[PDB]
């Protein structure tokens, strides 16, 4: 039930913004584990602090 | 000792297995104080290796709990060189019995990183000969000053090695095998006074 | 960030998340090769980009063989054409003490002091402040000759893993061991040491001038730094510390 | 290539273009960290990829303290489960010469020309490592103890002797190794450069698919082979 | 007319194929010069040899 994080991460980089590819893909894999753990309707990447 | 030579003394710093996980902070303390790291060894002290390391204390005093304590985890051993390394290491380290050292020397290493007598924070060498024995037992083939020049080393060979060398060279003459390094090495590994005979199968 | 290792430096993966587009990246390789050509520099580092309000201020610095002189820094708007900035002094950097906030776009914007304050002089003096206060050098990269000429250490390894977390293993990249250590810092704790990807990366994020990022790995050869941020000094820092 | 070059995504920038995915980049980073953990290798390199028909082969190699030691190469299909390949002998090297055909996948596959698929993979790996593995000048220092260590004061190759071809060695048993100028046939290496003088690209032509990057001013080197898995003996017809 | 070859290049790196991000952008700039030079209706990246 995830949104497509990867096209969003491709659109991140054109602004000079974001985690690149590897760190945001580990973020997306942790999002996949969180969505597989909990019954989540929408699990999108809010961002980083 | 004289003018054109120098005396860089050495001491042993022992990191007990309760405090080996906190090694970076105490490493910051010992490097920032002035002590230098020569070589650090991460060694698992065997119960059958701790007794030969502690023939000076455990061989006359009954304390097997510390012998079991040194085998409970990893042990880090390091060589230190400093101007007045023994005196400054005793001043920074402080006295033992860390229950009393928490009240007498609150800035010492045993007051912070220690709990009791047997579960000590660290261990340090006291005398220079004890430091030489501790370094020679734990560490590999390194050179400890002074080099015993003159008749000191000749007596060491003539009462520790050269009887066995005389008995080896006596049998090496009769007969004469070609390339006698094989015969001398096999004689020393075979007719060893300090090592027993080995028979593989 | 060195010009010969811009693609060989983890910029977006450093954790700050203020990097470059492929447009800006290819523009920096071509344009920093150009400013290595026409300006006779020993080596050129990409200093960073100031975000601004209506346009981005891309900043790069070039260095001579003396390695401790004030930097002949350069600026660009469209990240392609670069020109030299005037050298900075203390009396000229004093002039913007009555103004604050972000700065936008073209260098011809006049600020009210009424003495008209140019955007360009505020930009280069602010570049001088960020160079003086933050953007540290690593230990062992700058060794000392008996003369005044300092060479970059070709044999630089130079930071063990036990000295990664320490403040004292970083010096300020500023002419003044060799340089002033990071334990001479006000306030105490104005640098964020952070462990990314295990031991394969460390970041010394400046909090007095965010978002400055210092670029490791250990066992390397990068030995880089980058400031992308809002541009003004964080005077709010001891309250949040 | 080490995991450091896996971080910079340097396989695509070499220009071979078969490349690697951020899927496999993150998978090789975590899984080669595991390979360095479980097996006590000094250095672990992602060797490359063998092109498949039903599954893709991913190959990495581990090295001991001696840099010229026989490597313990490993294979993985789903890029996490790394498993130790056996060492290769000459008896398995002349065994797989009667099998001519594409690498399929599913390592229990059997060839009727029996002959196992894993034996073909291991013998092909030893053939590529003995033929077209590449070490530049001054990258490896022959210690007088008898072992080979990484030269840690290796200044990168200057631009004068990039194109000789006498400045690249082999990563096997034999400036103490055999150079590239004695390779049979001559001219079997695609000499190339990237944008500027920032990277030197060497592509093997006895095995189409290995690429060697080299930055001429830093200590960055390594070979990745992603390609067909076949030795073309058609190469004299090509030149 | 230039096609969306940068998002196609992100699809290439998702498949693992490609020259890299900056080299595919460089090919996109060369295709922009090719489109601006000649009256071309469709100028897509056939590939490289």
From Swiss-Prot, chains A, E:
Effect of inactivating the gene: Mice show hydrocephalus and the tracheal and ependymal cell cilia show clockwise rotation motion instead of planar beating. All three types of radial spoke heads (RS1, RS2 and RS3) are missing in the tracheal cilia.
Subcellular location(s) of the protein: Cytoplasm, Cytoskeleton, Cilium axoneme
Tissue: Expressed in the trachea, ependymal cells and oviduct (at protein level). Abesent from sperm (at protein level). Expressed in brain, kidney and testis.
Functional summary from the UniProt entry: Functions as part of axonemal radial spoke complexes that play an important role in ciliary motility. Essential for triplet radial spokes (RS1, RS2 and RS3) head assembly in the motile cilia.
Family of this protein: Belongs to the flagellar radial spoke RSP4/6 family.
Quaternary assembly: Component of the axonemal radial spoke 1 (RS1) and 2 (RS2) complexes, at least composed of spoke head proteins RSPH1, RSPH3, RSPH9 and the cilia-specific component RSPH4A or sperm-specific component RSPH6A, spoke stalk proteins RSPH14, DNAJB13, DYDC1, ROPN1L and NME5, and the RS1 complex-specific anchor protein IQUB. Interacts with RSPH1. Interacts with RSPH3B. Interacts with RSPH6A. Interacts with RSPH9.
Protein name, as recorded: Radial spoke head protein 4 homolog A
Organism: Mus musculus
Lineage, broadest ranks: Eukaryota, Metazoa, Chordata, Craniata, Vertebrata
Primary gene name: Rsph4a
Swiss-Prot record, chain B:
GO molecular function, one term: nucleoside diphosphate kinase activity
Keywords recorded for this protein, A-Z: Cell projection, Cilium, Cytoplasm, Cytoskeleton, Developmental protein, Differentiation, Flagellum, Hydrolase, Spermatogenesis
InterPro entries per the UniProt record, alphabetical: Dpy-30_motif, NDK-like_dom, NDK-like_dom_sf, NDK_H5, Nucleoside_diP_kinase
Gene Ontology cellular component terms for the protein in this record: 9+2 motile cilium; extracellular region; radial spoke; sperm flagellum
Top enzyme class: hydrolase
UniProt-listed CDD domains: DD_NDKH5-like (cd22970), NDPk5 (cd04418)
Subunit text: Component of the axonemal radial spoke complex 1 (RS1), at least composed of spoke head proteins RSPH1, RSPH3, RSPH9 and the cilia-specific component RSPH4A or sperm-specific component RSPH6A, spoke stalk proteins RSPH14, DNAJB13, DYDC1, ROPN1L and NME5, and the anchor protein IQUB. Interacts with IQUB.
Purpose of the protein: Functions as part of axonemal radial spoke complexes that play an important part in the motility of sperm and cilia. Does not seem to have nucleoside diphosphate kinase (NDPK) activity. Confers protection from cell death by BAX and alters the cellular levels of several antioxidant enzymes including GPX5. May play a role in spermiogenesis by increasing the ability of late-stage spermatids to eliminate reactive oxygen species.
PANTHER family: NUCLEOSIDE DIPHOSPHATE KINASE (PTHR46161), NUCLEOSIDE DIPHOSPHATE KINASE HOMOLOG 5 (PTHR46161:SF1)
Protein name per UniProt: Nucleoside diphosphate kinase homolog 5
Gene (name only): Nme5
Curated annotation (Swiss-Prot), chain D:
Disulfide bonds: none
Localization annotation: Cytoplasm, Cytoskeleton, Cilium axoneme; Cytoplasm, Cytoskeleton, Flagellum axoneme; Cell projection, Kinocilium
Phenotype upon gene inactivation: RNAi-mediated depletion in the ependymal cilia results in a near complete central pair apparatus loss and alters the ciliary beat pattern from planar to rotational. Multiple radial spokes proteins, including those in the head, are markedly down-regulated in the cilia.
Keyword Metal-binding belongs to the record: no
Tissues of expression: Expressed in the testis, trachea, lung, oviduct and ependymal cells (at protein level).
Keyword set includes Methyltransferase: no
One GO cellular component term noted in the UniProt record for this chain: extracellular region
Record keywords: Cell projection, Cilium, Cilium biogenesis/degradation, Cytoplasm, Cytoskeleton, Flagellum
Annotated GO biological process: axonemal central apparatus assembly; axoneme assembly; cilium movement; epithelial cilium movement involved in extracellular fluid movement; flagellated sperm motility; mating; radial spoke assembly
Family affiliation: Belongs to the flagellar radial spoke RSP9 family.
Function summary: Functions as part of axonemal radial spoke complexes that play an important part in the motility of sperm and cilia. Essential for both the radial spoke head assembly and the central pair microtubule stability in ependymal motile cilia. Required for motility of olfactory and neural cilia and for the structural integrity of ciliary axonemes in both 9+0 and 9+2 motile cilia.
Assembly and binders: Component of the axonemal radial spoke 1 (RS1) and 2 (RS2) complexes, at least composed of spoke head proteins RSPH1, RSPH3, RSPH9 and the cilia-specific component RSPH4A or sperm-specific component RSPH6A, spoke stalk proteins RSPH14, DNAJB13, DYDC1, ROPN1L and NME5, and the RS1 complex-specific anchor protein IQUB. Interacts with IQUB. Interacts with RSPH3B. Interacts with RSPH4A. Interacts with RSPH6A. Interacts with CFAP61. Interacts with LRRC23.
